[PDB]
Amino acid sequence: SPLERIRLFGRAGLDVVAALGRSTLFLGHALLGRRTPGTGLHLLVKQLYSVGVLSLAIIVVSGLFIGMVLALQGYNILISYGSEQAVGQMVALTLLRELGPVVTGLLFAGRAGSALTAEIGNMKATEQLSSLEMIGVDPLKYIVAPRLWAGFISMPLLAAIFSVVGIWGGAMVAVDWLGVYEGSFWANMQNSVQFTEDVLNGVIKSIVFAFVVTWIAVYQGYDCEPTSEGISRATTRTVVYASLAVLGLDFILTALMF
Amino acid sequence: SPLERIRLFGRAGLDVVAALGRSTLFLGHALLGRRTPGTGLHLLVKQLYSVGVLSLAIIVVSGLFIGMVLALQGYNILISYGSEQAVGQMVALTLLRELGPVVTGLLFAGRAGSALTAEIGNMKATEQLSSLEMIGVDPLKYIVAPRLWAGFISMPLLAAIFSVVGIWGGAMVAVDWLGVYEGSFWANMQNSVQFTEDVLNGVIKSIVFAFVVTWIAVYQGYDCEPTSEGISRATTRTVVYASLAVLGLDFILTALMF
Amino acid sequence: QASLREGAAGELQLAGVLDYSSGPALREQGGRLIRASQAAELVVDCSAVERSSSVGISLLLAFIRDARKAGKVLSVRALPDDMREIAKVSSLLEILPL
Amino acid sequence: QASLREGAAGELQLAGVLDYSSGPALREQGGRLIRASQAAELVVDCSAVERSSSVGISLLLAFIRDARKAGKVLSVRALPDDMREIAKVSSLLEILPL
Amino acid sequence: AYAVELKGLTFKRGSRAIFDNIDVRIPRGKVTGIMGPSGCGKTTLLRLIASQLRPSKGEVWVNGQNLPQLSRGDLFDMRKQFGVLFQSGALFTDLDVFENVAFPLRVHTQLPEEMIRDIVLMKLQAVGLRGAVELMPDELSGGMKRRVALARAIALDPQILLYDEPFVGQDPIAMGVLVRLIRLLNDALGITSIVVSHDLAETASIADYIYIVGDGRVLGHGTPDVLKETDDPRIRQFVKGIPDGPVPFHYPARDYRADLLG
Amino acid sequence: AYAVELKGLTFKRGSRAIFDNIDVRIPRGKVTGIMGPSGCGKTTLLRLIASQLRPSKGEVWVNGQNLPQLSRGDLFDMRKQFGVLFQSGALFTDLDVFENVAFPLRVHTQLPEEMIRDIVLMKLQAVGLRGAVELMPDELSGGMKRRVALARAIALDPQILLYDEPFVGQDPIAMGVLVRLIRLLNDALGITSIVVSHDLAETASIADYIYIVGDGRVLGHGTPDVLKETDDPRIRQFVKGIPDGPVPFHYPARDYRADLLG
Numbered sequence A, B: 001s002p003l004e005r006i007r008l009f010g011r012a013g014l015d016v017v018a019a020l021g022r023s024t025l026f027l028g029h030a031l032l033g034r035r036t037p038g039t040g041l042h043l044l045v046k047q048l049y050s051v052g053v054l055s056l057a058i059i060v061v062s063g064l065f066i067g068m069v070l071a072l073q074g075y076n077i078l079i080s081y082g083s084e085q086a087v088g089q090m091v092a093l094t095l096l097r098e099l100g101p102v103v104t105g106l107l108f109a110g111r112a113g114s115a116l117t118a119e120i121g122n123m124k125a126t127e128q129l130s131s132l133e134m135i136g137v138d139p140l141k142y143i144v145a146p147r148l149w150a151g152f153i154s155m156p157l158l159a160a161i162f163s164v165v166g167i168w169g170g171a172m173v174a175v176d177w178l179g180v181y182e183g184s185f186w187a188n189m190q191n192s193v194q195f196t197e198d199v200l201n202g203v204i205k206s207i208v209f210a211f212v213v214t215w216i217a218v219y220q221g222y223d224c225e226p227t228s229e230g231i232s233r234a235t236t237r238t239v240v241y242a243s244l245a246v247l248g249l250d251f252i253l254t255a256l257m258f
Numbered sequence C, D: 001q002a003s004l005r006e007g008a009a010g011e012l013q014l015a016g017v018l019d020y021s022s023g024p025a026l027r028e029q030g031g032r033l034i035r036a037s038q039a040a041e042l043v044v045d046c047s048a049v050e051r052s053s054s055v056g057i058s059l060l061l062a063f064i065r066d067a068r069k070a071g072k073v074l075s076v077r078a079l080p081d082d083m084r085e086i087a088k089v090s091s092l093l094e095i096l097p098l
Numbered sequence E, F: 001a002y003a004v005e006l007k008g009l010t011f012k013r014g015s016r017a018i019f020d021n022i023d024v025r026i027p028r029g030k031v032t033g034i035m036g037p038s039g040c041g042k043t044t045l046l047r048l049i050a051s052q053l054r055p056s057k058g059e060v061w062v063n064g065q066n067l068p069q070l071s072r073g074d075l076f077d078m079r080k081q082f083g084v085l086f087q088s089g090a091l092f093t094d095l096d097v098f099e100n101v102a103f104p105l106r107v108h109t110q111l112p113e114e115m116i117r118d119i120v121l122m123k124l125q126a127v128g129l130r131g132a133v134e135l136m137p138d139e140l141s142g143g144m145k146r147r148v149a150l151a152r153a154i155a156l157d158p159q160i161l162l163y164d165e166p167f168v169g170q171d172p173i174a175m176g177v178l179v180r181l182i183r184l185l186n187d188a189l190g191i192t193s194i195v196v197s198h199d200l201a202e203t204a205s206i207a208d209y210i211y212i213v214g215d216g217r218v219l220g221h222g223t224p225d226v227l228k229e230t231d232d233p234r235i236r237q238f239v240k241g242i243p244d245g246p247v248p249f250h251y252p253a254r255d256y257r258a259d260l261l262g
């Protein structure tokens, strides 16, 4: 029925409505609820390991490849303009103000934005997440608070590591394989950086959709209905949305500052 | 034990070894095994819907955002060079030869590279994938062959749609919000395209790691051990690898052709 | 396999083995090839039936849709044993008039 | 709660309620605060025990590790009823010498 | 006199009215096993009487006070009274077996890290999983993966404890050891235990005052005997095989004649 | 004389030696129920005697010929003989109930799309899920989600059929209707049925010649009676509660004295 079809559409409207409402409530309860008995900092260490460190080889190799691609594209894009040696101010400006954090999102939100949702989803599905209450610990502070903290304090560091490896790979292909001159590269690069105005720009950009990624990437895991199909669908909702939001907030955050 | 630690490391070596070996065998059996009784083409239609169409809104919105970001970055990157009106030959060359298909991979491999693995994973886990044999149909031709075909014939179309919407959004922000002149944009764009040499380049680039994405994105789903934790880990392995391979083959495919 | 015969005057004879193989041919050669020509009062009697599965049940069933659609009335005689049981399971208690 | 007393001459008196609350204090005030000073042959007897859970079981247990580490030998007397059962479950059949 | 009583309790999940003005009254010291049809809301009743789920209205008297009307600082202290054993164990995949069993102690009590080890050890011996004090539950075979959970429950020596479908889907050796333990804990430790199992046979075997929960209303209750011949059509259909009765066998079809004919 | 026999069968999953030179011989017309301890390899035996899993060496005589030595064009034709009912239904989430049940017909037979509908309808009536001929299994309550699978199995009228843990984890009403159907199919349709259930009680209740599979070797077999007093320690430990016996209760710990003391 078309009228009831639109009824279902509107029900989905109110559904995402109440969804992110409940999400912000969840986030509040998690970051500022109380202090639980069985918490600490070792939790944060274990998480930060599972979320950042394990997801580090991926972004290292990905930074390598995307950097040398950025080079092999800039060299050939610009040799048609003579200003070949200026490739440094490209491979280090695009890889540092916009593409750096965007790809770092789409990868972090790819792996650690998912195997983080499936983790606390599975937890909810084997009731493990529930027996915590019957014990007495608040899960939203023992199970998910270290997730959020491993998010906020990993993805920015990951973006930095990615940008570094990207620039270095771009140089290594440009210097050794393209043949452009050694010192000229870093020279034009440092002459065209504007630290507080591009580097810090990219870092605040990284942090904001670090927060946004590992916010949904954990909420979805907390909300998914407990069944092996439910989790299998939540760990896809949290890639759809974690990429949508990465790019959307990249766009807004770059309209705030060109 | 360190010696046994290296033993485990080497066991993982042989493991990924035999893994992708078995993967290529699987792919062969799937695409060229036999012709099954209960197959057809309606299967391909249903799949192609579930894989392409549902994953179309994501890449539409993502193309929009990434295009207007590419613009808002090019305008400001290049106004410092005077050649402002040349933004068209940027927002339409980067979004069409390298970044277009790469982001289309990281998104398709994000959503339809996962909710495709979880699907045929869940199938294997509720034994649904197994009763097909006890009936007699070969699953590798009824369950996964339409997956592969919905992969190969969707991701390239998706890359094209993405590049189109990206260029159009870049124009819409450049024309209406940046104020650069209407005809000049498309003019410098078409004067600097080299169809058979950039457009077709981007399309073959899209196709190759369409094949590569929806190859692992279905193999992993076929191999994952049947348990709600197994699938929850496979649908992360098939984002790690589906992004690794996207970028790696992008790099190789752009070293084949600058 | 099995077969069909003896039309236009009731007394629909049914042969031995009604399986998934011999199914459709008998359906089509009976439903229109015979039930278009009948007079009335179709006695379908399963005398010389060897062995039949639910496919035969659904066959004598389709034998009834057309006859009802053909206006004329029909009934079954000499219902075999295995058929009797396959009807016993999925009730078909009276829907098989004898 | 409960308490500890009567050291240096065996006859370790134990008071009423040994719970998770009154646990650690009794452990520390017995293990070193008392077992460093004892002569030998430590008779720990649970006469005036009101009510105790497994925490008390593990307490009289720790009462044995130190004594064994302190060389001197010890034993229990007048084992209460609930303790008797909490030992009965997790065997502790002979590991509680009486 | 009673360990747990549920006065005027009702619950609605999205106004679905899961529970509807119910009254259950558990006797202490006696293993009572509640159960009911599919989707009848048992586990909901568990998380209720364990105060994980906030009731809509009513009160849950538990060894004295009622829970939904307690202060967090006091509710947490009450948590020391009741243990819960889910099916599928519900172990923390992060921590090994030993730390997993110790967890409730490391939460509600401040003991010398040796003494915690001794309590954990004696409990694990009581349940038998004393050897695997190092395994991670990922490494642990699905059977004992439940007995370790039971040991974690009986830690702190709670006076009552809940069982969410304990004997469901395991070889009768594991089912046998588990049904021996859940009864040993009650015969010895004198702790109220609330089995919650779809399995009628073993439940009615061991239980003392079984209930039957259906569509938001207790569908009667009794000791196994009175329940075996209640003659209430709903119940007597449940507690026996008798597939056709108040709960229909067939789905609400239209007609076995018309639909197949027209 | 026998429906299915397994001569000299052995199987190894990664050289683990799942099955090890076994000999099982199923009589036709009689519901036999095989079972065994946890991880004992039953479902493996299913997929073997249903020819989804290629045996290492041995032969599986099935109503005549043996399968692993048949041509694909003939193996497919043999597939028409044996049906399989998994637990959790194993329905195709893609297709609705009706198409789901029709699937085997739409595969092995070319029938007028009406006639397929009539066979599907009579089967669904036989199992009772005749009404929900439109629901998608996603919409279907987990109980009937199995009876529809059973109807799909009995489609084509296979002469033997397998049951992978049928009566495991459902309210005794659904378990009752299912145990009535799995027996009605055998008493009427005279089709060999192979229950495979950890649940000892109902299995031994309905079964005729039960087996016991353990660590790659059949641990004996018999009708329920002889099996109830075999006095073989392993078996008599299995078929009764008796938790402590050949299968140990405790884990291989070191010492209940030293470890807790030293």
Ligand SMILES: CCCCCCCCCCCCCCCC(=O)OC[C@H](COP(=O)(O)O)OC(=O)CCCCCCCCCCCCCCC
Pocket (backbone or CB within 6 Å): A009, A012, A013, A015, A016, A017
């Ligand atoms: C009058 C107020 C009362 C209610 C108003 C709520 C409407 C606002 C929310 C819109 C979301 C509707 C989508 C529902 C469709 C659906 O099927 O749902 C689509 C999905 C969920 O679909 P499923 O539940 O079927 O999986 O939801 C989403 O896509 C959520 C992302 C939407 C964006 C959220 C933030 C909005 C950003 C700002 C808007 C940009 C517009 C630009 C204007 C300048």
Ligand SMILES: CCCCCCCCCCCCCCCC(=O)OC[C@H](COP(=O)(O)O)OC(=O)CCCCCCCCCCCCCCC
Pocket (backbone or CB within 6 Å): A054, A057, A058, A061, A064, B240, B244
């Ligand atoms: C001629 C030289 C060309 C050599 C080609 C090899 C390059 C391709 C290597 C593949 C990348 C591996 C990452 C896969 C993700 C993963 O492992 O996934 C991450 C896993 C996850 O571990 P878990 O098992 O605990 O989940 O971590 C690992 O165990 C892997 C550790 C090392 C893997 C290699 C990564 C660093 C080495 C990269 C080499 C780059 C060379 C630099 C060029 C100058």
Ligand SMILES: CCCCCCCCCCCCCCCC(=O)OC[C@H](COP(=O)(O)O)OC(=O)CCCCCCCCCCCCCCC
Pocket (backbone or CB within 6 Å): A070, A073, A074, A077, A078, A081, A083, A086, A089, A090, A091, A093, A094, A098, A099, B069, B070, B071, B073, B074, B077, B078, B081, B083, B086, B089, B090, B093, B094, B098, B099
């Ligand atoms: C993924 C692919 C990467 C993109 C590469 C494709 C081709 C490059 C872009 C086309 C523009 C160059 C044509 C003009 C010729 C010219 O005179 O260009 C060369 C001129 C010559 O002046 P100089 O000698 O002083 O450098 O210099 C410049 O234009 C400065 C810009 C260099 C690039 C620096 C990085 C800013 C670019 C945007 C960053 C983020 C965008 C990337 C993702 C959206």
Ligand SMILES: CCCCCCCCCCCCCCCC(=O)OC[C@H](COP(=O)(O)O)OC(=O)CCCCCCCCCCCCCCC
Pocket (backbone or CB within 6 Å): A015, A016, A019, A020, A023, A024, A208, A211, A212, A215, A216, A219, A220, A237, A241, A244, A245, A248, A249, A251, A252
């Ligand atoms: C050209 C104009 C562009 C238009 C701009 C509009 C889009 C803006 C960006 C889109 C955001 C993506 C929406 C994803 C949410 C969703 O899909 O909503 C859907 C999901 C849940 O929906 P379901 O559970 O029903 O599927 O939402 C969530 O998971 C809950 C949290 C949503 C995250 C919101 C992020 C807000 C960003 C705040 C940044 C400020 C913080 C900085 C502090 C330091």
Ligand SMILES: CCCCCCCCCCCCCCCC(=O)OC[C@H](COP(=O)(O)O)OC(=O)CCCCCCCCCCCCCCC
Pocket (backbone or CB within 6 Å): A240, B054, B057, B058, B061, B064
């Ligand atoms: C101003 C009010 C508008 C608010 C935003 C409207 C949200 C409407 C979302 C519906 C979109 C299609 C959903 C189809 C459902 C489906 O099949 O697919 C739904 C998909 C996922 O499919 P599933 O149902 O299988 O989960 O969900 C989505 O991802 C939808 C993403 C919506 C994102 C909206 C962001 C706003 C766009 C910003 C553009 C800025 C331009 C402005 C320039 C001036």
Ligand SMILES: CCCCCCCCCCCCCCCC(=O)OC[C@H](COP(=O)(O)O)OC(=O)CCCCCCCCCCCCCCC
Pocket (backbone or CB within 6 Å): B015, B016, B019, B020, B023, B208, B212, B215, B216, B217, B219, B220, B237, B241, B244, B245, B248, B249
């Ligand atoms: C015109 C040219 C034609 C090109 C032909 C395309 C060939 C594509 C072959 C790619 C293989 C895909 C793997 C399939 C998925 C799978 O099953 O593979 C899955 C297995 C893992 O199995 P398990 O994790 O389950 O054990 O292996 C992998 O994870 C593969 C990882 C893919 C990484 C790609 C990296 C390539 C780039 C390397 C370059 C090094 C650069 C160094 C220079 C300094």
Ligand SMILES: Nc1ncnc2c1ncn2[C@@H]1O[C@H](COP(=O)(O)OP(=O)(O)NP(=O)(O)O)[C@@H](O)[C@H]1O
Pocket (backbone or CB within 6 Å): E013, E018, E036, E037, E038, E039, E040, E041, E042, E043, E044, E045
């Ligand atoms: N969070 C929830 N949101 C919506 N529905 C729920 C939720 N939790 C439970 N339900 C439904 O409400 C009922 C409660 O589930 P459950 O506790 O398993 O029922 P039960 O009768 O106690 N045990 P069972 O018969 O196995 O379902 C079921 O019908 C669930 O589908």
Ligand SMILES: Nc1ncnc2c1ncn2[C@@H]1O[C@H](COP(=O)(O)OP(=O)(O)NP(=O)(O)O)[C@@H](O)[C@H]1O
Pocket (backbone or CB within 6 Å): F013, F018, F036, F037, F038, F039, F040, F041, F042, F043, F044, F045
């Ligand atoms: N593909 C596989 N790869 C590796 N191990 C497997 C595989 N399939 C099964 N196994 C293992 O081999 C055994 C076979 O599983 P299963 O068929 O369930 O055993 P079963 O004795 O027949 N039934 P159950 O006791 O419930 O496990 C189990 O121990 C599994 O862990």
